[PDB]
Amino acid sequence: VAWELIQLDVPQEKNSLKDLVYQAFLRLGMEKTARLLDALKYYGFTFSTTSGITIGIDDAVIPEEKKQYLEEADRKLLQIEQAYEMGFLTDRERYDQILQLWTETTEKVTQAVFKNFEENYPFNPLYVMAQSGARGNPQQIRQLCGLRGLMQKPSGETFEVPVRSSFREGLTVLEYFISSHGARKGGADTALRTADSGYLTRKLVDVTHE
Amino acid sequence: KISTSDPVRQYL
Amino acid sequence: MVQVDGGRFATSDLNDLYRRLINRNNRLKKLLAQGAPEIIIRNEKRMLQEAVDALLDNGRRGAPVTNPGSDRPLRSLTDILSGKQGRFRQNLLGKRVDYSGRSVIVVGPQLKLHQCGLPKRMALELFKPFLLKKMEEKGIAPNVKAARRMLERQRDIKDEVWDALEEVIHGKVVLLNRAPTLHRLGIQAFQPVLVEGQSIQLHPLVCEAFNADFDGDQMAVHVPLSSFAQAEARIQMLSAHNLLSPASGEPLAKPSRDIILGL
Amino acid sequence: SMARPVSIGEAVGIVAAQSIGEPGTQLTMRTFHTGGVAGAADITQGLPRVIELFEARRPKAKAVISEIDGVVRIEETEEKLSVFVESEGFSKEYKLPKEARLLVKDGDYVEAGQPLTRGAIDPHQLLEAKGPEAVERYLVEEIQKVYRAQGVKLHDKHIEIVVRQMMKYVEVTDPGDSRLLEGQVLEKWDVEALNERLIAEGKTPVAWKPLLMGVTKSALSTKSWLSAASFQNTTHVLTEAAIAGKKDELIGLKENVILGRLIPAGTGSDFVRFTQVVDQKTLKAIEEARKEAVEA
Amino acid sequence: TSVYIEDVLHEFSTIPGVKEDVVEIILNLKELVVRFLNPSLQTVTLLLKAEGPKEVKARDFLPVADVEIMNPDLHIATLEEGGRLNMEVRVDRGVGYVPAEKHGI
Amino acid sequence: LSQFKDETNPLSSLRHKRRISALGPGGLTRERAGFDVRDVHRTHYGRICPVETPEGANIGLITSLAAYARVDELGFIRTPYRRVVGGVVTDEVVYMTATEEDRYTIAQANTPLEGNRIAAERVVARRKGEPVIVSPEEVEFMDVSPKQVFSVNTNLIPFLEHDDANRALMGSNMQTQAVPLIRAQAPVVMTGLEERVVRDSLAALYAEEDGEVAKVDGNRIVVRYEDGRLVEYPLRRFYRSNQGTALDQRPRVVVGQRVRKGDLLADGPASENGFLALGQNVLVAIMPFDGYNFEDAIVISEELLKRDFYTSIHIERYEIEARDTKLGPERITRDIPHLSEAALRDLDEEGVVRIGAEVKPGDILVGRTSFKGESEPTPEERLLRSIFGEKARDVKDTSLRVPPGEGGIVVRTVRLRRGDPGVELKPGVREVVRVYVAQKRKLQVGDKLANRHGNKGVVAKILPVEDMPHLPDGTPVDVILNPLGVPSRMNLGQILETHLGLAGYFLGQRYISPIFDGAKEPEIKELLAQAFEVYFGKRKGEGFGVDKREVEVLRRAEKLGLVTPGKTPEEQLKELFLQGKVVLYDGRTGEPIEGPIVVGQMFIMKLYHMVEDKMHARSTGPYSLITQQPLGGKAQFGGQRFGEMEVWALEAYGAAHTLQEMLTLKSDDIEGRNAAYEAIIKGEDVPEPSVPESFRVLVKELQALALDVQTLDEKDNPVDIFEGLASKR
Amino acid sequence: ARTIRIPVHMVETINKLSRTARQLQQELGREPTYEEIAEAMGPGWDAKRVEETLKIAQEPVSLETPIGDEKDSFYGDFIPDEHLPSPVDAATQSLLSEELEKALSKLSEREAMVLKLRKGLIDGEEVGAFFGVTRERIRQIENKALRKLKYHESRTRKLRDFLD
Amino acid sequence: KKEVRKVRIALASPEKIRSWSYGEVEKPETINYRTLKPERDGLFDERIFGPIKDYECACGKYKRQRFEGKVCERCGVEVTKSIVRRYRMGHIELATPAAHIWFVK
Amino acid sequence: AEPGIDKLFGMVDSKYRLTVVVAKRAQQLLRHGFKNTVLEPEERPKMQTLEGLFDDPNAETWAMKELLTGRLVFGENLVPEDRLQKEMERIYPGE
Numbered sequence A: 001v002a003w004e005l006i007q008l009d010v011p012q013e014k015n016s017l018k019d020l021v022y023q024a025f026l027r028l029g030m031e032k033t034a035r036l037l038d039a040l041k042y043y044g045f046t047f048s049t050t051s052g053i054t055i056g057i058d059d060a061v062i063p064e065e066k067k068q069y070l071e072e073a074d075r076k077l078l079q080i081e082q083a084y085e086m087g088f089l090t091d092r093e094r095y096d097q098i099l100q101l102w103t104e105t106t107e108k109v110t111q112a113v114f115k116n117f118e119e120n121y122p123f124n125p126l127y128v129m130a131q132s133g134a135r136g137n138p139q140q141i142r143q144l145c146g147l148r149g150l151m152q153k154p155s156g157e158t159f160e161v162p163v164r165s166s167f168r169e170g171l172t173v174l175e176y177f178i179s180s181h182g183a184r185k186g187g188a189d190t191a192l193r194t195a196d197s198g199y200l201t202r203k204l205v206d207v208t209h210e
Numbered sequence B: 001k002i003s004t005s006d007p008v009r010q011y012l
Numbered sequence C: 001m002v003q004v005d006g007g008r009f010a011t012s013d014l015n016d017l018y019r020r021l022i023n024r025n026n027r028l029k030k031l032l033a034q035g036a037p038e039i040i041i042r043n044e045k046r047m048l049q050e051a052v053d054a055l056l057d058n059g060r061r062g063a064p065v066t067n068p069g070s071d072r073p074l075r076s077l078t079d080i081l082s083g084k085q086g087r088f089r090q091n092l093l094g095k096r097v098d099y100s101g102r103s104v105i106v107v108g109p110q111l112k113l114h115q116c117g118l119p120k121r122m123a124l125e126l127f128k129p130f131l132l133k134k135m136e137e138k139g140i141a142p143n144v145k146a147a148r149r150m151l152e153r154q155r156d157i158k159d160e161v162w163d164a165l166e167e168v169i170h171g172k173v174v175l176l177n178r179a180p181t182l183h184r185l186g187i188q189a190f191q192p193v194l195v196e197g198q199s200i201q202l203h204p205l206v207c208e209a210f211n212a213d214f215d216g217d218q219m220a221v222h223v224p225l226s227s228f229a230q231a232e233a234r235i236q237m238l239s240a241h242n243l244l245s246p247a248s249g250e251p252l253a254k255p256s257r258d259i260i261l262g263l
Numbered sequence D: 001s002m003a004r005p006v007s008i009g010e011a012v013g014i015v016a017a018q019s020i021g022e023p024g025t026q027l028t029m030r031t032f033h034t035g036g037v038a039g040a041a042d043i044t045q046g047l048p049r050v051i052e053l054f055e056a057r058r059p060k061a062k063a064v065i066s067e068i069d070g071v072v073r074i075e076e077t078e079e080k081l082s083v084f085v086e087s088e089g090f091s092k093e094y095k096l097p098k099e100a101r102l103l104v105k106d107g108d109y110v111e112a113g114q115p116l117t118r119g120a121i122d123p124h125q126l127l128e129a130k131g132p133e134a135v136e137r138y139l140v141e142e143i144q145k146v147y148r149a150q151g152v153k154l155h156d157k158h159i160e161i162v163v164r165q166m167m168k169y170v171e172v173t174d175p176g177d178s179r180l181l182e183g184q185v186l187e188k189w190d191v192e193a194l195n196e197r198l199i200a201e202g203k204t205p206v207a208w209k210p211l212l213m214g215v216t217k218s219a220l221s222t223k224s225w226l227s228a229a230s231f232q233n234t235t236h237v238l239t240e241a242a243i244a245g246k247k248d249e250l251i252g253l254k255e256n257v258i259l260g261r262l263i264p265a266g267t268g269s270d271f272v273r274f275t276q277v278v279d280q281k282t283l284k285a286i287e288e289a290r291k292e293a294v295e296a
Numbered sequence E: 001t002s003v004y005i006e007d008v009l010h011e012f013s014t015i016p017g018v019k020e021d022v023v024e025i026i027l028n029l030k031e032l033v034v035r036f037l038n039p040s041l042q043t044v045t046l047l048l049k050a051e052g053p054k055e056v057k058a059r060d061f062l063p064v065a066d067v068e069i070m071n072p073d074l075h076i077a078t079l080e081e082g083g084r085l086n087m088e089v090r091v092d093r094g095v096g097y098v099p100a101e102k103h104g105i
Numbered sequence F: 001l002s003q004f005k006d007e008t009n010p011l012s013s014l015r016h017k018r019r020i021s022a023l024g025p026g027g028l029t030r031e032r033a034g035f036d037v038r039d040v041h042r043t044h045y046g047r048i049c050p051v052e053t054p055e056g057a058n059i060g061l062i063t064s065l066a067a068y069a070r071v072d073e074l075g076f077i078r079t080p081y082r083r084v085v086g087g088v089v090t091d092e093v094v095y096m097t098a099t100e101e102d103r104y105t106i107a108q109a110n111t112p113l114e115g116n117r118i119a120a121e122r123v124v125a126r127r128k129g130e131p132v133i134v135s136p137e138e139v140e141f142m143d144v145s146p147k148q149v150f151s152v153n154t155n156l157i158p159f160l161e162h163d164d165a166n167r168a169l170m171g172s173n174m175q176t177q178a179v180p181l182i183r184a185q186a187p188v189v190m191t192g193l194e195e196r197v198v199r200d201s202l203a204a205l206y207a208e209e210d211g212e213v214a215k216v217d218g219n220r221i222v223v224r225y226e227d228g229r230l231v232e233y234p235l236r237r238f239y240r241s242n243q244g245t246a247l248d249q250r251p252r253v254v255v256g257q258r259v260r261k262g263d264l265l266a267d268g269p270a271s272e273n274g275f276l277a278l279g280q281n282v283l284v285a286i287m288p289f290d291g292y293n294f295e296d297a298i299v300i301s302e303e304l305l306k307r308d309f310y311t312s313i314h315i316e317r318y319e320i321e322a323r324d325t326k327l328g329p330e331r332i333t334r335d336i337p338h339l340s341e342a343a344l345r346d347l348d349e350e351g352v353v354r355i356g357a358e359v360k361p362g363d364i365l366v367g368r369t370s371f372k373g374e375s376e377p378t379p380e381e382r383l384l385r386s387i388f389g390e391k392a393r394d395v396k397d398t399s400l401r402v403p404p405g406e407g408g409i410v411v412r413t414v415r416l417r418r419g420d421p422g423v424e425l426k427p428g429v430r431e432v433v434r435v436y437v438a439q440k441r442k443l444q445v446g447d448k449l450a451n452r453h454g455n456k457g458v459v460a461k462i463l464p465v466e467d468m469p470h471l472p473d474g475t476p477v478d479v480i481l482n483p484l485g486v487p488s489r490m491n492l493g494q495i496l497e498t499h500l501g502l503a504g505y506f507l508g509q510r511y512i513s514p515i516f517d518g519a520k521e522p523e524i525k526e527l528l529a530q531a532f533e534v535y536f537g538k539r540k541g542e543g544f545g546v547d548k549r550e551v552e553v554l555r556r557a558e559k560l561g562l563v564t565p566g567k568t569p570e571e572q573l574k575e576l577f578l579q580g581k582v583v584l585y586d587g588r589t590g591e592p593i594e595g596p597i598v599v600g601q602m603f604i605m606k607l608y609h610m611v612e613d614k615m616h617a618r619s620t621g622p623y624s625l626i627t628q629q630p631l632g633g634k635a636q637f638g639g640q641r642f643g644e645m646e647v648w649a650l651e652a653y654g655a656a657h658t659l660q661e662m663l664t665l666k667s668d669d670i671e672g673r674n675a676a677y678e679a680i681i682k683g684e685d686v687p688e689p690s691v692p693e694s695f696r697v698l699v700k701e702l703q704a705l706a707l708d709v710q711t712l713d714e715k716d717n718p719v720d721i722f723e724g725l726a727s728k729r
Numbered sequence G: 001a002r003t004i005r006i007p008v009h010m011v012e013t014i015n016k017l018s019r020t021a022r023q024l025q026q027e028l029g030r031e032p033t034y035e036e037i038a039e040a041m042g043p044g045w046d047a048k049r050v051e052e053t054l055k056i057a058q059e060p061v062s063l064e065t066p067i068g069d070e071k072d073s074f075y076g077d078f079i080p081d082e083h084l085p086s087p088v089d090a091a092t093q094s095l096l097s098e099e100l101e102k103a104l105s106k107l108s109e110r111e112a113m114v115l116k117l118r119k120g121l122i123d124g125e126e127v128g129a130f131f132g133v134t135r136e137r138i139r140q141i142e143n144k145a146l147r148k149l150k151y152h153e154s155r156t157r158k159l160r161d162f163l164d
Numbered sequence H: 001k002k003e004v005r006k007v008r009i010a011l012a013s014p015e016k017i018r019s020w021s022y023g024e025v026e027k028p029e030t031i032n033y034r035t036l037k038p039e040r041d042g043l044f045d046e047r048i049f050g051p052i053k054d055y056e057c058a059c060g061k062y063k064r065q066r067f068e069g070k071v072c073e074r075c076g077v078e079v080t081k082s083i084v085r086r087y088r089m090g091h092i093e094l095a096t097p098a099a100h101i102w103f104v105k
Numbered sequence I: 001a002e003p004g005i006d007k008l009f010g011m012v013d014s015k016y017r018l019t020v021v022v023a024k025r026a027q028q029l030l031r032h033g034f035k036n037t038v039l040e041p042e043e044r045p046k047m048q049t050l051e052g053l054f055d056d057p058n059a060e061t062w063a064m065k066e067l068l069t070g071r072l073v074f075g076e077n078l079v080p081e082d083r084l085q086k087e088m089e090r091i092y093p094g095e
């Protein structure tokens, strides 16, 4: 019954596990489940220690294609400029065209880094965590190995220039200040939802308690 | 409305 | 009407309003009896009226003030029931539990979902009366009042006492709470396993139910006094019994961060 | 929390109210009645919406629904466009200003309350047009649209529980006991009508009209004044509750909590509040008491 | 395992003519390594008294018959002028780590 | 606006002195308008840190200023910007107003500079809040420095460059919470301001002019300047900081020493050698242990306690007054009316406690005697006294005691009696008695430590040096940090610190990696390269080579892709070392930890424990006068709040009684709680709740207004809440 | 005018006190210690008198006043309560009365109840304590029963742990 | 004894106002300093609202529990603790009526 | 988790009922004397400072331990409300 509800055909993600738990709950019974839970807890903990997964700096691997994609998109920006220097593209057109360049370029390096890890280092420390239901956001990874690219202005109009850097290398002084703007807005949203989170629940219990 | 004024006016 | 400091006295604002009414009411009677010039009788009756409003509800028509110090609406009975935060109003913000506790939490890796590590020092105060009696059932103390003084100072506890508490907590369980109690799993019951120190050992799997990291988040702890409250608490409120979330038929005892990475 | 059927006495009301209040912390929060007056800002995302949805409200970019189910016809003139819906019976003119991007085309059918404009819909209108069954179904799915979009996967059940309560009240147009213009609890009318046509004769049909009030109002006005004294105006709620000599039958957890009384939901279930236990030794003991009943 | 400066009452005091504070000294003592030769020596009290413009090292402790100090040149304190330091430092034979709170000598 | 100086440690106070707030006069900016102000506006450049602000509702509003930021004539944070005429950059600087900054084309400091010459055609600049790739011929003005961009408090972070602005905030606020350890060490890697921090703050004592030293007391350094003068420099031996952290000035200069003008004579509370030092550099393995480091928990090696490493001294100031009651003055005497002399020992001085006495919770810090009743004696208490000793001092024991939690050893005491020197004794106040107590705080499981980057966490387990991760040569690791806390958060700077640290360990050297100009990945690999020879060179000569274990982890390391297959283990390990990670053996098993693990010198500080930290556990205690819910204060802890969000949690569960209990027996049921205790006392199952006072208070409040609230029966008939006190007469 | 009534004499008294403090504020630059006030006032004025008078002069405070940071703080949740027996005391009276009640029964009623009732039932009179039997039998049984009662209670130590 | 199953707000009859009440507070006499006791008939009077002490009366004619349900011959005090002092109610008799602002506004 | 909680859940029509039963059984277990049990002999309740759980540690841990067996009977209206407490006092000593 243990084999019937398990998939040994793959690395155990949090989802495979999540599923394992559920199955085990319906199939074998509540307490019997609790046991499997601590069983997993115990070995996971152990094997984790021994595995020797560790954050290092060289572990965050930057793709060799980062330079390419950047440069290719770099010259492409030059065209957009030549095309504006002439009078073809309206003030706006230029802008929305540039952003489009990066938004695509940025997502390009992201599938690049992963492809890098996927093919070359299946066992990178920084990667397994994200693949495993463990820890890591694809967008997050991008900011260390690929690059965090577009930060918005105070109001909401995204900046014209991207943040060329990654966290592995020195996010410079202003690419920083530039990025700083979007930061406040975010933290600002978190403090407001902490309470709004109560706001919403309040209303619902007022009508729904009975 | 407001009390003082009314009595003042009242006896005044 | 209370003695404060040096001789300060504190009184529910309602009393200054009451005096308002009574004085006016009386002055009225005396003004009727003395003889009665119309303007003055009404004038008073007006004041009287207003006054009767004041105790009931202040601010619906003008706002009464204690003399120059605080231009504050003396809380009217209305303000009492309603208020910025008044009667039925704060009746729901919360009240303070008598058998409660609160400390910093820390991961209890070996701990089983079933249990939780509770500081004995904390356990002592929390289960004080349950201990007292237990002391008397053993030779440690002759009686309650004895058992009490026996524990009034920290240096006077015989190691025999711990063995008593450790025996009192045998199969009882407590409730642990987190900062924003968002869902019912925001409070779960565990069996206490008394331990040394200040920190509260929590299980890793339930760290997902309560949104609790270990950078200092402090969890409170409550105690089920009735045999009933205890029955419900360990039967249908114990952590190991509520594994699947009420939101989604998806488990909430999922192997969190480290366990996956390991597995 | 367990995977078997639901167990009688579970505080579902709240269990629900919570499952929807937590994820809410993850939804965006720009402005409640979302967007900003500028050119053409058409929808409302994040929490701002989930507020616009539980509380039945007029979205900024409203979408004119089709009160009539029939066929489509469009016109060309400069200033304002226009979509006409008609059946062999009748046609209805619909004013669609410049900003309105139309979803429908010259040619096919449009069910009652279907989208004729692109964007949000007003529950009230959808209520009137396609029915409660439609508002209800619109609210639920419209709400989940946000959460799904944000990762949260919460069972529809909960939202339903809530929405239902937004429609536990209806309007009156054909009286019997209390005058017509009154908004009262749907099932309470199914109570009147039920006994007025079945047990006591004289069919005095109590004609009503499905009403859709926002979660806030739904609660703001309920049977128990206690519950009402808690939030809106303690001052008014009571005044009325008083004059009328209201008997707050305690059901519901808010009201019965102020009393410090056992909760109506949970173990406080009238279903199990009374249950006794026995040992076969005490079972024969009581029968012996019965046996003793034989006189002489 | 224990120390007694004669004019000092609590551990957080500072002695005149003595650069180091009680806490730094009791700390340097922990650095002191002694060696007795037989079981008969369970608890040995080492004694030392030095005055004036001298540097107090561990070799300055009066010798004890069956006890040897492997840490002579260790630095206990720096005495200026009118520097009066007379202490009695206990020494024991035990195992592991024992917080000063645990034994309370 | 004016507040308690926050001097947990010098740097802290320094910040609290320069911080800028929104809220205030009421005229400027109140609590309502926020989101446009709270955000980091464009002009906040060099004028205000974009990181330094407080996490929490009050965010962005309150914030300390930047590095070079200076208020010129009228409060306009001008930021410095050096002039660049043509393709020439100047060493001249203009403190420009926010407004004027926009009229020019400004460029960043990162621009390749030959001196006065800009070096690249397409080099970045930013017109007005807009990033713009400008030409060297348009570059009118350039940024002054990377440092001017942020605050002092932030400038102290090693590789700020690699850490997400979000968690670097945590790092900057964490330092403000650093507590002075008796053993203060500077980071193995610093930014460059540690010196200036301690110097500009007033921690260490610096030498005015050149001379020689005369006397070097533990209480004074009388130096002799060459001018023919000598001055005595007292040293705040052990002073109480507002938040209870020790402030001691330990002398670092020996007798008869020629001092340079402005050199450390003594070190401040937290300085090692004129450098800022909070917490201590500790070797650290960065791997997962059992669960001891699960979400954000830290495993620590007992070995760190053996050495007085994380240990800090604390002082709390207990105070009691002898009040004048109309019943009779409250006397402060050694006399404690009812039971023993054993408790009177440390009460040596008649009344006050003896300096240097170890006071545990529940010992008399000071005695005092007030009178028994309000106005009348006691009929029942009259008989008892008479029975065993009528002649009994009727005076009450109202004596300052050691509050639960802890006390140390009394180090100072103050008593102000009748004939006041030049003091202000409040009215009614006969006399005051202060008691300063100090206590050594050794690191323990409840404590929380955190590096400058933001990795915050608590100790979950103190392991025996016996079995924690040990290196090939017997040196064990002090602290084992979980990796999982690194990806989500984005601060590789810590992982960059640990690497440089590894080299500093074997190379026995500390470094200074500036804010964004500092150390570079190749330079570090270069020092690690040097370290491999100190690590493994000695290993060669000392006599041995490589383990079965060492080779074994290599096998698994090449199958991984860390080492170039085919090279010699010696050569491979170098590679593997350069990567910042080395082989580690379990310690418990002695086997290796499959896969190289990184390790190294990471600076880590310990954070101050707030009064809340004192875990509050309450059995029974006081109760509010108007509201009858549990209240604490002095010695009784006070109950925890059971809020709505928590009610529902129970509501949701079938927790019926457990919730009634929380609303009756535990907080408001007056008659309930009483019979409750008693019941427990006799081992009787707690009684079934009586009506809560909340309810009764309501009904009457409601009766206070015309309304009549009457409870009812099965059949609509009365029932009674107010047990028997409402029927008349 | 006041919450706590004050006769006309106290009033003018307070006015005079006030007026005096005014003339005293005139030159010292020092808000008079209650020494000046006594002097300047007149015949029988002393420190104790002035400190007392100004103590009654202060009007009460609003048990309900905006407290701490003025947000939502009502001055009354912080004051504790005294009559009410905190659990600790309810437990006291239980054992105390159950144990006192056990002793009271195992003794001869004659002089034990006399002193039990005279001391514990009405008010605190050796002679007036016993019915017909004079003082000699009072002191006789009082001191002989009280000691037999205390010395066996010394044996089975129940009372020694001073319930107070 | 019976479970409270339904609560009901209803208007106050002037006769019910008096039914709940005890005595009439006829004078603005809070408490008079010299003796922190209730002044005359005023707001705090003991007849009107009750005894201010555990089981004892004000003067003390009866002082324990045996007679818990009776009142004092010369002065009026029926006792259980001071809770009766906090649950009882008195009423003021208005000269010429006035109205509840809760209903008028 | 706890012993056969599933088995228990199954023996009741409603989850919240099982809690009521156990709790009301634990009550009587203590009140009428703690020996009011149905399964004491061979394999019974046990704690380890000695094997002394046999006397009075946790009430309901017993109740559950008994209910798990098929000796008890819980109904909606099984035995008349006041005649029960009488018959129980009569047969179980220990006070």
Ligand SMILES: CC(=O)O[C@@H]1[C@H](N)[C@@H](OP(=O)(O)O)[C@@]2(C(=O)O)CS[C@@](O)(C(N)=O)[C@@H]1O2
Residues within 6 Å of the ligand: A135, A136, A137, C211, C213, F488, F489
């Ligand atoms: C998607 C993912 O990888 O999960 C993260 C982690 N559960 C955790 O991250 P931390 O800040 O502790 O580093 C966090 C939490 O504490 O609840 C806060 S951030 C988070 O909202 C996000 N979307 O990145 C999300 O929740």
Ligand SMILES: [Mg+2]
Residues within 6 Å of the ligand: C212, C213, C214, C215, C216, C217
């Ligand atoms: Mg946290």
Ligand SMILES: [Mg+2]
Residues within 6 Å of the ligand: C213, F295, F296
């Ligand atoms: Mg976290």
Ligand SMILES: [Zn+2]
Residues within 6 Å of the ligand: H057, H058, H059, H060, H061, H062, H072, H074, H075, H076, H077
């Ligand atoms: Zn009397």
